[PDB]
Amino acid sequence: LVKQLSSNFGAISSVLNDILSRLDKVEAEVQIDRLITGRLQSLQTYVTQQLIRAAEIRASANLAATKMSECVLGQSKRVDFCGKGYHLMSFPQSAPHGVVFLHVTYVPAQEKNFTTAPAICHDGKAHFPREGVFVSNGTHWFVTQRNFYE
Amino acid sequence: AIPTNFTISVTTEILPVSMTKTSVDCTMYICGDSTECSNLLLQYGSFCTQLNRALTGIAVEQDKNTQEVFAQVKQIYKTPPIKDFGGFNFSQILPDPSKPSKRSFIEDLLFNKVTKFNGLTVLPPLLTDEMIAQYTSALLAGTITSGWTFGAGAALQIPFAMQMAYRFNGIGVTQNVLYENQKLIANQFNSAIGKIQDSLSSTASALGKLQDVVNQNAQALNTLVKQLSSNFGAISSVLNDILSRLDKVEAEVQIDRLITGRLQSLQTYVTQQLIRAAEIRASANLAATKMSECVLGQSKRVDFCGKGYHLMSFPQSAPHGVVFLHVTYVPAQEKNFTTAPAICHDGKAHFPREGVFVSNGTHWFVTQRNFYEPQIITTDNTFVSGNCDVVIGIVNNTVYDPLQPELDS
Amino acid sequence: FLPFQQFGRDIADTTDAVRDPQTLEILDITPCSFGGVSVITPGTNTSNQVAVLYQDVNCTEVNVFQTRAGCLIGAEHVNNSYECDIPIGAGICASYQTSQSIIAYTMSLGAENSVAYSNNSIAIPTNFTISVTTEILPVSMTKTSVDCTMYICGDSTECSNLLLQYGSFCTQ
Amino acid sequence: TQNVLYENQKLIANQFNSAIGKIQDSLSSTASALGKLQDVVNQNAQALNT
Ligand SMILES: *[C@@H]1O[C@H](CO)[C@@H](O[C@@H]2O[C@H](CO)[C@@H](O)[C@H](O)[C@H]2NC(C)=O)[C@H](O)[C@H]1NC(C)=O
Ligand SMILES: *[C@@H]1O[C@H](CO)[C@@H](O[C@@H]2O[C@H](CO)[C@@H](O)[C@H](O)[C@H]2NC(C)=O)[C@H](O)[C@H]1NC(C)=O
Ligand SMILES: *[C@@H]1O[C@H](CO)[C@@H](O[C@@H]2O[C@H](CO)[C@@H](O)[C@H](O)[C@H]2NC(C)=O)[C@H](O)[C@H]1NC(C)=O
Numbered sequence: 099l100v101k102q103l104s105s106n107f108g109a110i111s112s113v114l115n116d117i118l119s120r121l122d123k124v125e126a127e128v129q130i131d132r133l134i135t136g137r138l139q140s141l142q143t144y145v146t147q148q149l150i151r152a153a154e155i156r157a158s159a160n161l162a163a164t165k166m167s168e169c170v171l172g173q174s175k176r177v178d179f180c181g182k183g184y185h186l187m188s189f190p191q192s193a194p195h196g197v198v199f200l201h202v203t204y205v206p207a208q209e210k211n212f213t214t215a216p217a218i219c220h221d222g223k224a225h226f227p228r229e230g231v232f233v234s235n236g237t238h239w240f241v242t243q244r245n246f247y248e
Numbered sequence: 249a250i251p252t253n254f255t256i257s258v259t260t261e262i263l264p265v266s267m268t269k270t271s272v273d274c275t276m277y278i279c280g281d282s283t284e285c286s287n288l289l290l291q292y293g294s295f296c297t298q299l300n301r302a303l304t305g306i307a308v309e310q311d312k313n314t315q316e317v318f319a320q321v322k323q324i325y326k327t328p329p330i331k332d333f334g335g336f337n338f339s340q341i342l343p344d345p346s347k348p349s350k351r352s353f354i355e356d357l358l359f360n361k362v363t364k365f366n367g368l369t370v371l372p373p374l375l376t377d378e379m380i381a382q383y384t385s386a387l388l389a390g391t392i393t394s395g396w397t398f399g400a401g402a403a404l405q406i407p408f409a410m411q412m413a414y415r416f417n418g419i420g421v422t423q424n425v426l427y428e429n430q431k432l433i434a435n436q437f438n439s440a441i442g443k444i445q446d447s448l449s450s451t452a453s454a455l456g457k458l459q460d461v462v463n464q465n466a467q468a469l470n471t472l473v474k475q476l477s478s479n480f481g482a483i484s485s486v487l488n489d490i491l492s493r494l495d496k497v498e499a500e501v502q503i504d505r506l507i508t509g510r511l512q513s514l515q516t517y518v519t520q521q522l523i524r525a526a527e528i529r530a531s532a533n534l535a536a537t538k539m540s541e542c543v544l545g546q547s548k549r550v551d552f553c554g555k556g557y558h559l560m561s562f563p564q565s566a567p568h569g570v571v572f573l574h575v576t577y578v579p580a581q582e583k584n585f586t587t588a589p590a591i592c593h594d595g596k597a598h599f600p601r602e603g604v605f606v607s608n609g610t611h612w613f614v615t616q617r618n619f620y621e622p623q624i625i626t627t628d629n630t631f632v633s634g635n636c637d638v639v640i641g642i643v644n645n646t647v648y649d650p651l652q653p654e655l656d657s
Numbered sequence: 658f659l660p661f662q663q664f665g666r667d668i669a670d671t672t673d674a675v676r677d678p679q680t681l682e683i684l685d686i687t688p689c690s691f692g693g694v695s696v697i698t699p700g701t702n703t704s705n706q707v708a709v710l711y712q713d714v715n716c717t718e719v720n721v722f723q724t725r726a727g728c729l730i731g732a733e734h735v736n737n738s739y740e741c742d743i744p745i746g747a748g749i750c751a752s753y754q755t756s757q758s759i760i761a762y763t764m765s766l767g768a769e770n771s772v773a774y775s776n777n778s779i780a781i782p783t784n785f786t787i788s789v790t791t792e793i794l795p796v797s798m799t800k801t802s803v804d805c806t807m808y809i810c811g812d813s814t815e816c817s818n819l820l821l822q823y824g825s826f827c828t829q
Numbered sequence: 830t831q832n833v834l835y836e837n838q839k840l841i842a843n844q845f846n847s848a849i850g851k852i853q854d855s856l857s858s859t860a861s862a863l864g865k866l867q868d869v870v871n872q873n874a875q876a877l878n879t
């Protein structure tokens with residue numbers, strides 16, 4: 099925007115005082131009008147870009163507020179909304195013109211291949227887990243939590 | 249009213265993700281191959297480079313949108329050669345190895361529905377249709393073979409029927425309903441997919457949300473080009489026709505008239521593109537949100553990923569967009585049952601641990617809220633708190649104690 | 658062309674074709690090949706070597722690698738894929754690697770992996786790790802304010818009086 | 830647990846009814862409550878006047 103003050107826009111000079119100090123009114127008003135049109139257009143361009151950028155910032159701020167409410171104040175069931183992993187808790191940190199969230203997540207680290215089954219027959223009855231899944235270590239059947247071998 | 253039967257439905261949600269990456273050269277558009285016009289244009293400073301910058305920013309954000317929507321998986325997963333998925337047929341959404349581009353049948357259907365000299369160019373996307381198809385293949389193979397585990401961390405293999413059992417538990421329906429009705433569920437799923445294929449193969453308007461984006465950008469460019477035909481007060485719209493007949497002094501004035509008009513035309517175009525780009529970005533952010541919370545996980549958000557109780561979703565690529573196939577559980581048939589909030593027994597007030605109390609007119613049962621499956625009311629189904637003189641609408645019945653006959657013998 | 662037609666025009670009113678005034682044949686006028694020129698470069702704190710992309714042209718009209726993004730000159734084509742560094746377009750990215758030089762390659766989409774799926778095998782985690790990630794979001798931007806009179810006219814009454822003929826353009 | 834509601838159902842209904850009455854009293858007395866919508870009306874009207 100400041101650089102635009104250096105443009106002539108068709109005028110004999112970009113410096114308004116240099117136009118006024120050398121030419122009398124009648125034609126000088128024309129030369130000034132050329133600069134007014136160009137500089138006014140420059141401001142309109144600047145303001146339009148700022149309004150669009152401001153809309154972008156507002157969307158980001160709304161997202162940040164949403165995360166603050168549903169991650170720091172609560173616990174998020176939304177996948178990858180507050181970082182990768184199963185969300186536990188988050189911590190806000192301030193930053194210049196922004197906010198930084200530290201997302202604490204639970205990530206499975208080591209796994210084993212187990213044989214499974216959807217149900218077990220006993221006396222003709224079909225037994226299903228109340229919680230967890232059925233696993234076999236190759237000789238014995240166990241019931242264990244879905245997200246942690248126990 | 250408690251549902252006694254259910255139907256598995258598949259819905260299609262179509263979202264724009266990107267728009268054509270145009271770039272406009274102000275000198276060739278405004279002046280072309282004319283130095284006199286270019287020299288006049290230089291008196292307007294940076295008006296051009298701010299337009300090249302704005303369009304570059306848009307072009308970059310079109311690739312950012314695609315990457316955030318599709319590039320959510322660190323690895324490219326692939327299905328096994330044996331499709332033992334419990335009766336669920338995925339052959340119409342998985343890559344077809346026989347095509348020159350490994351797209352699914354449905355993706356091929358989607359691509360068949362959506363259809364320079366003045367300084368106006370179109371940049372290629374960074375991610376080709378091949379790269380997008382591979383990404384949707386990886387996301388689909390992960391979803392099918394590992395459920396939601398590939399989203400949080402490592403892809404942990406699980407039988408598909410058990411994965412669906414978890415998805416059913418996630419909506420308040422005990423996993424045993426799925427296994428007892430597994431064949432029915434697989435047949436309903438396969439039929440729903442066939443219906444999706446028939447719709448896409450017959451309803452052209454299905455992809456209107458993406459076609460309109462294509463139309464809006466194309467028309468805008470046509471409008472910009474049409475503006476070269478305007479005089480803007482000059483004796484002629486053709487710059488060379490002005491330069492070849494008039495000498496410098498007045499010709500510079502006639503050229504200035506065209507520069508002002510054409511520069512205004514570009515500014516209008518760029519402003520409209522920035523606003524439209526913001527719209528596309530919001531849509532892409534929504535698509536990425538759905539991808540993360542529907543395909544990689546399971547959504548508890550009502551109507552976020554289609555109507556019904558969400559089970560799973562499948563991404564499909566489309567021209568300048570993404571198509572989600574949302575698999576939902578919808579109650580199908582219901583009966584009128586009499587209910588009660590609690591039952592008095594020995595003065596104790598019994599409440600269900602899970603489910604509600606129902607009566608068929610002669611006997612009281614406890615059943616799941618979302619699926620009629622009557623069980624005998626027992627001490628292992630209900631809990632005691634307080635007594636019958638507080639709860640409004642409490643009824644008299646008996647609660648069977650499974651331990652009593654065990655102690656008598 | 659019909660016997661009375663001498664010139665053809667495009668949507669922009671530029672000449673599309675002309676009929677030669679001496680020999681009555683039609684010549685199409687296609688403006689000669691042009692395009693944007695982009696420079697692919699590592700930062701100047703690392704190297705002053707660059708590659709040049711001539712957009713949407715063949716390398717004949719201008720070692721040399723023809724891509725659908727254009728003719729890339731100065732970057733060596735490498736068969737090995739990598740993570741995208743400096744994007745070019747159409748699946749091609751470039752980077753500065755090992756002497757050292759600029760390379761061009763088809764970008765990798767991630768490691769290839771298969772899931773050991775079967776109808777009776779489940780993988781259940783036995784251990785876990787607690788990870789912390791950082792998410793950075795903009796919230797605000799500098800609260801600028803611009804005075805149209807000082808910007809446009811400054812300390813000049815004659816200009817201000819002319820500006821008043823434009824009404825509310827400023828106060829908006 | 831759902832038993833809390835049933836044991837306290839009368840209290841809950843009375844609190845709900847009172848809260849609604851408070852909403853009515855606020856809307857009947859606080860003009861600024863709908864400012865978010867009035868500003869939209871004002872922004873478009875002024876723009877046309879401009
Ligand atoms: C599967 O788990 C069971 C239970 O832990 C194992 O059975 C035990 O094996 C140990 C020897 O490692 C014996 O000392 C115990 O008496 C066994 N208990 C029972 C109840 O049998 C079984 O060996 C494991 N199998 C495999 C292949 O790991
Ligand atoms: C639940 O609804 C399904 C259909 O949505 C029923 O399945 C149909 O059953 C009839 C038997 O009268 C068959 O002729 C149809 O071919 C079946 N359709 C499918 C898709 O399998 C099912 O029987 C219903 N169950 C109950 C208990 O009402
Ligand atoms: C999954 O559904 C597709 C639907 O097309 C099945 O493909 C058809 O299979 C039948 C016989 O198996 C052929 O006669 C058709 O020509 C096939 N159609 C197409 C388009 O390929 C596929 O076989 C089904 N898979 C399973 C395992 O049942």
Ligand SMILES: *[C@@H]1O[C@H](CO)[C@@H](O[C@@H]2O[C@H](CO)[C@@H](O)[C@H](O)[C@H]2NC(C)=O)[C@H](O)[C@H]1NC(C)=O
Binds near residue numbers: 608609610611
């Ligand atoms: C309500 O359900 C109960 C339990 O299913 C029904 O009682 C059974 O009725 C059948 C006849 O249809 C008898 O053969 C069983 O011996 C009954 N069992 C018991 C424990 O009483 C009862 O008839 C049903 N009532 C209605 C109106 O449907």
Ligand SMILES: *[C@@H]1O[C@H](CO)[C@@H](O[C@@H]2O[C@H](CO)[C@@H](O)[C@H](O)[C@H]2NC(C)=O)[C@H](O)[C@H]1NC(C)=O
Binds near residue numbers: 592643644
């Ligand atoms: C539910 O059962 C209780 C007791 O089994 C009933 O309470 C009796 O009500 C009658 C009539 O009001 C009294 O005369 C008895 O003295 C009460 N007995 C007890 C132990 O409180 C109660 O009325 C029954 N509810 C319904 C709806 O029939």
Ligand SMILES: *[C@@H]1O[C@H](CO)[C@@H](O[C@@H]2O[C@H](CO)[C@@H](O)[C@H](O)[C@H]2NC(C)=O)[C@H](O)[C@H]1NC(C)=O
Binds near residue numbers: 207
């Ligand atoms: C689970 O993983 C943790 C590391 O993430 C293991 O803790 C390490 O155990 C080794 C023992 O071999 C120590 O030398 C390391 O210092 C431990 N690291 C930390 C951070 O405490 C843990 O033992 C693993 N548990 C199982 C059952 O595999």
Ligand SMILES: *[C@@H]1O[C@H](CO)[C@@H](O)[C@H](O)[C@H]1NC(C)=O
Binds near residue numbers: 209210211773780
């Ligand atoms: C499970 O078995 C397959 C069979 O080849 C193997 O490739 C895979 O690595 C095994 N899983 C683990 C966690 O070792």
Ligand SMILES: *[C@@H]1O[C@H](CO)[C@@H](O)[C@H](O)[C@H]1NC(C)=O
Binds near residue numbers: 583
């Ligand atoms: C429940 O009873 C009402 C009583 O008229 C009836 O209109 C309604 O259709 C019944 N519900 C079902 C599912 O039949």
Ligand SMILES: *[C@@H]1O[C@H](CO)[C@@H](O)[C@H](O)[C@H]1NC(C)=O
Binds near residue numbers: 640641642
């Ligand atoms: C339900 O309504 C009937 C209407 O006559 C009434 O007699 C009965 O007591 C009511 N029950 C409850 C729990 O409100």
Ligand SMILES: *[C@@H]1O[C@H](CO)[C@@H](O)[C@H](O)[C@H]1NC(C)=O
Binds near residue numbers: 702703
């Ligand atoms: C970039 O230059 C600065 C200053 O010379 C240097 O400190 C920094 O490490 C350089 N960056 C890289 C990636 O080498």
Ligand SMILES: *[C@@H]1O[C@H](CO)[C@@H](O)[C@H](O)[C@H]1NC(C)=O
Binds near residue numbers: 714715716717
């Ligand atoms: C010109 O570009 C086309 C692009 O497809 C290429 O096939 C051709 O070989 C290039 N060179 C020519 C025409 O000499």
Ligand SMILES: *[C@@H]1O[C@H](CO)[C@@H](O)[C@H](O)[C@H]1NC(C)=O
Binds near residue numbers: 736
């Ligand atoms: C790269 O792969 C192509 C495949 O056609 C091959 O012709 C070429 O020689 C390879 N380059 C090197 C350096 O191996």
